[PDB]
Amino acid sequence: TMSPNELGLTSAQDDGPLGQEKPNYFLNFRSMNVDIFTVSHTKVDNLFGRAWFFMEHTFTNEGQWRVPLEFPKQGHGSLSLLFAYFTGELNIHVLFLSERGFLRVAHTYDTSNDRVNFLSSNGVITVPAGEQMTLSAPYYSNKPLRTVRDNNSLGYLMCKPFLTGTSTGKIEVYLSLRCPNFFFPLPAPKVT
Amino acid sequence: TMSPNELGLTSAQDDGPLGQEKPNYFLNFRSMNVDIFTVSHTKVDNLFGRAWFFMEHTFTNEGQWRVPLEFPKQGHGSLSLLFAYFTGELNIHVLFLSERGFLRVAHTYDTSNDRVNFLSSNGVITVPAGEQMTLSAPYYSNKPLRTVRDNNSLGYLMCKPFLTGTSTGKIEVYLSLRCPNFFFPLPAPKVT
Amino acid sequence: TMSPNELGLTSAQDDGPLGQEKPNYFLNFRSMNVDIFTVSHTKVDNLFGRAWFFMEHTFTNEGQWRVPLEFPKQGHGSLSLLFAYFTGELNIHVLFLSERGFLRVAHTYDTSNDRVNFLSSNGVITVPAGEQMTLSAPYYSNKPLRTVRDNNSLGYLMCKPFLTGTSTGKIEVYLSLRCPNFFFPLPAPKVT
Amino acid sequence: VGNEIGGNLLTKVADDASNILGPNCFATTAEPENKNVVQATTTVNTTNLTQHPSAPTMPFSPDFSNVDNFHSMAYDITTGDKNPSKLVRLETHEWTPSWARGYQITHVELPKVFWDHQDKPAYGQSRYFAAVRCGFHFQVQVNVNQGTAGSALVVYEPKPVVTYDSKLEFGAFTNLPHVLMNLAETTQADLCIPYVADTNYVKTDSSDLGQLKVYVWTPLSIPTGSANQVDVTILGSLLQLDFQNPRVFAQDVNIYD
Amino acid sequence: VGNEIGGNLLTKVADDASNILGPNCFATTAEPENKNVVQATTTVNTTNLTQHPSAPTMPFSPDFSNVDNFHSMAYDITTGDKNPSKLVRLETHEWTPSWARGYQITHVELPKVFWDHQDKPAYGQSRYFAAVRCGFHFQVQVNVNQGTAGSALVVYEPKPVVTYDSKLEFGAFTNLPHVLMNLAETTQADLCIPYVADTNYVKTDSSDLGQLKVYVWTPLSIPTGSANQVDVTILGSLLQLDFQNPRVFAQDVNIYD
Amino acid sequence: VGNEIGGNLLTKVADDASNILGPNCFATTAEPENKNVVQATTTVNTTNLTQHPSAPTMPFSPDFSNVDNFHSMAYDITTGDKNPSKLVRLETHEWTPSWARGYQITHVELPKVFWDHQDKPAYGQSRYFAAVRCGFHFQVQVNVNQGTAGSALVVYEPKPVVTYDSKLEFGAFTNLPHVLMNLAETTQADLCIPYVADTNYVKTDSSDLGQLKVYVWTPLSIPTGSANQVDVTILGSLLQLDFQNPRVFAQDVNIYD
Amino acid sequence: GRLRMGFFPNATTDSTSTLDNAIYTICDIGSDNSFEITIPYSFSTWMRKTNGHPIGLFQIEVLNRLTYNSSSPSEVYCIVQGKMGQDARFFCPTGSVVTFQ
């Protein structure tokens, strides 16, 4: 039968270990699970499998653009802030807004600035002007885990455009991840 | 073996439900049952099976006599005051003290005075002058239970005497019950 | 496994009955028994089986010497003071220091002085001058147990010497017991 | 060991020295009647937590069946329960002969009409709940002598219809659960309407379930001598009722977003 | 779960991360020695209730038989117990030769005579109890030289007889447990008297059990030279004794109504 | 009975009067999460006693193996443990050619030399223990060009020898674990020395284990051109180490009487 | 409150010192307020003088101030007892160093 513990009478100091799926009942109540869709939208793989805006850059010349990639404190991706460590594939969505040219894109977790001077070794997929690509950067991280908060939690992204004439433009960036491994959930974030 | 509970150590707040025949012992003591008679004098059927005086009425004429019948706060019948509800046969003992005549006797639980005007329908057993009868009135009660205390807990008794000449007298009454059904014992009564 | 009781957490008021060989442990500790000799030196029979000085008497004549024999509050025999009652064989070691003569020795628990006047009945082993004997006096005690403390806990010893000429000397005494029966250990003694 | 162990030692030691008469002492140890426990009791949507409970009491050889074996009340035991689903008079109106085709005779706010007055069997419970999910069984009654003739349109209009009523073409309302009932032929119409809404539950004391209406299919053709006061009555029964959300007494609660 | 569960988790977690050396921690949880229990002890007509008991103590490898295996006291172990039932001298009197037939020689209040003085074996216990139920065994002794003759009537008289003694005909007293004992023939008389009364128990220190008497059947015929001082002695033993009602020391208590 | 019995009566009584709908009440009684228990935890030479414990906690689906499966540190897991037994340079000295036979080249206090400086692998632990029992493995190294010649006596001298050194005849020291090592032939000597003392354990930071020495068997015969700076080095390893007695940091403790 | 009692075997310097490295036992006041601490045999020799070198330094430091209330004492009494372990042994009987009474 039902114990008084499952009826509401408990002790907060007896909750450890963390993660106790204890059932709560009353005479007219029972945990009822109802699913409205064929799958879950709470699973890390599904939720995060959907991109979210990151930032935009306007380029008037080929100069290279390197930006630290970090988890959002803004979109649905904020749900990541509930975790401390991450590891796994990283989907980067880049849009090249230009009239005539090409955009070199590359990703590295390496903090050294110089390693990115010769962009070709790193990757540098090519998005023709007016096209958008989605490259999935692997976990080539020199650190087993990525503190999820760091201003560079995610590796740096490189964008250099091979323009042809006076043409200029702007590069919008969106980020998403493939199968994410989060660990050791930390306390919920505050609001600004 | 014997527990400390049965040795005197108990708690008054743990007596419910009502009616706990718990045994009490000590090294030189044990509940010993000794019977002095072939039967019990504590059983409701036996005790109450014995009548007790009720009241007396002196009649100088045939006028009818109706009196509420109630449980005694005076004789051994007082043991009934320990209960709240009653139901069952009612033995009425009437003595007709007269020189020459007849006594009509009847019993009804009906509160209406008029129903008793025509006494014959009700009963009206006939006790010749100088004779005493014991009529057992059934539970013709419009109420399933008779609060034992009511000034009319027991149904009303009717006595009309068919005298013949100037003869007069007095009618003594005694009451007893046949197999009594008592329920929900209440607290003991006070003394006057 | 190990209970918290055996880890040091206990209650002094729950020690009775007397004599609880409870084991005490810790992660790196276990009761280890190591024996350095083929036998015990703690056993009552062994320890007390070894004599200890008692007293000395100097005699210039045959006059008899009677001395109460008691347990020592001085040598290793003091370990007896930890007990209350004794019973068993008593080993008496006597040294006769004399030039020419004999020493009559006898032992009795009898308090009466007169019984010892005729020494022969009691015993009176003979130690020639310059010799030492060890007589084992039986428990001819009129009391089942000997309070271990009494100034006469042990029976009285008698020494009468049959000297021959002007010769004189001194009689040193040592005591030990054969198989001792001690009972009801009492609190440890104080120091002077 | 200890302090639990004592009944046995005393009981035993007493036992060991016992002679012909027997032991001169008996000792028994156990737990107190008032132990360190916690009791929890739950009634309808309630939970009572007590950490200092006591032995529950009750009368002598009690009977909790609570059923009167004599049936001094000869009614189904579940009478009070089903009472609110009982059939009731929701409306009455007198059709006027002059009225044109398509005119609205009478209408009833659904479902709040079943709690129309404090004299409605369902009014009681309806007060203590904000959410409702129920089915209906209407019986629109219209009586007219044989000499007279005419026809009325009894139709159920969900909130969607009621909302955009003027945008709908009359004569097509036959697409909704209705009963073109030809007077002088039928005196009553029957309509079984299940829970119909765009939300799982409807706010109690609301018209969200839509409303039943009665229109003039063809005006009343009342002869000279014939009577001219025809009354239209709407009766309603709850095929199935369900009150869920608890709330203060008759307080407007928003189940919607 | 919790707070009971901890010895296992710590003991286990310690267990899981253990390497070659072994675990670096062990944790064990259990109940305290001082638990929440209640102890009850009962001795003769007494009951001690303690709700804060402690582990009972006792000497090393103790012997509670309490029996001296050497019998330094060579007496039956139940000597002290039976002592009060012991035979005792209840009375002594010197019959006077002049006395007429039917004269009362001597009498003894029964049963309070067995507690006649504080020097009576039964006097001790008799003090601590108000109720008594016992049987008697009398031995009236009367010695007389052969030359002399005579006869005495040793008879037991219950309270009923003692009460109405003058109303009874002497010479018929032979109907009561008696012993017409002819002197010069018998020197002692034996009488076994069971508990006789109209009440189950008799008040201690009362004469309700009746009294034993000695009458003159036929006066003493003492010749000239023969001695003239004959003594009559009454001895009593309790075939069976029973003290029930407890009471203060020698305080008059009424067992009767 | 009681106060434990209540969940059943209420649960039952509720049960008995139940109708079609079911019971209208459920009651359950049990023990609180915070029970009267005692927890004990023991770590290395420590014991924590708590009489008011609480349910131990831990992260989600935790792994206490504590072993890095990637081996970011490619070392034996027991590296840190064995570290103090590691081979180390105990001494170095330059033999002077002029030195006579039997001269003492160099010596090392045993066993306190393994904690010679705070830069010794064993210095760390050696501080937290007063007692020691260990075995040694020495490797005295002496290198000399082929042109030169000579011989040194590497011998272990227990405290007994070190104490009475002058009373012993040199040339007989070959009775002790030694290595007459002829230069120009051998460049290193090996000596395995077990725990040798007249006491089960030796005080830490003491020379009681004796000391290893190096003498001049036959002086160095260094030719004209040949080098003249020969260095003698003493290396030491602990075949087996054992620190037992706990003590404050590097505080002189007397294990001896 | 709590109280930590440690013991440095064979110690001689009678001075307060951190017991983190000593054999200690933390005592949390409750129902069973008697706390034990075992010292395993620790000496260079197999047997040790009965009346020789100290057994060690015994220190009982405060871990958590003894708390109380309006009707409870602000300070309590303590008693320290000592006994031999189940592996205890004595060996040679020697002369006496004191005289009992």
Author numbering:
A (entry chain A), B (entry chain A), C (entry chain A): 25 to 216
D (entry chain C), E (entry chain C), F (entry chain C): 32 to 288
G (entry chain B): 153 to 253
Sentences from the paper on this structure:
Human parechovirus 1 is an example of such viruses that contains 60 short regions of ordered RNA density making identical contacts with the protein shell. We show here via a combination of RNA-based systematic evolution of ligands by exponential enrichment, bioinformatics analysis and reverse genetics that these RNA segments are bound to the coat proteins in a sequence-specific manner. Disruption of either the RNA coat protein recognition motif or its contact amino acid residues is deleterious for viral assembly. The data are consistent with RNA packaging signals playing essential roles in virion assembly. Their binding sites on the coat proteins are evolutionarily conserved across the Parechovirus genus, suggesting that they represent potential broad-spectrum anti-viral targets.
The recent HPeV1 X-ray structure at 3.1 Å resolution allows us to answer the question of whether these putative PSs correspond to the ordered RNA segments seen in the virion, and whether they bind to the CP in a sequence-specific fashion. The extent of ordered RNA in the X-ray map is thus significantly less than that in the EM map, but Kalynych et al. could build a model for a 6 nt long RNA (AUUUUU) in the form of an extended single-strand contacting the protein shell. When we examined the deposited electron density map, we found that some of these RNA residues were poorly modelled. The model is an excellent fit and reveals extensive RNA-CP contacts, comprising both hydrogen bond as well as van der Waals contacts. The RNA contacts multiple CP, principally VP3 and VP1. The contacts include three base-specific hydrogen bonds, two to the initial purine, which is therefore confirmed as the consensus G rather than the previously modelled A, although the latter could also be accommodated in this position. There is also a uridine-specific contact to the base N+2 3′ to the G. N+3 is modelled as a uridine which stacks on the side chain of Tyr21, although any base could make this interaction. Amino acid residues in each extended VP3 arm make multiple backbone hydrogen bonds to the RNA fragment neighbouring the one that they contact sequence-specifically, creating a chain of RNA-CP contacts surrounding each five-fold axis. This arrangement strongly suggests that the capsomer for PS binding is a pentamer, because these important recognition sites would not be present on a protomer.
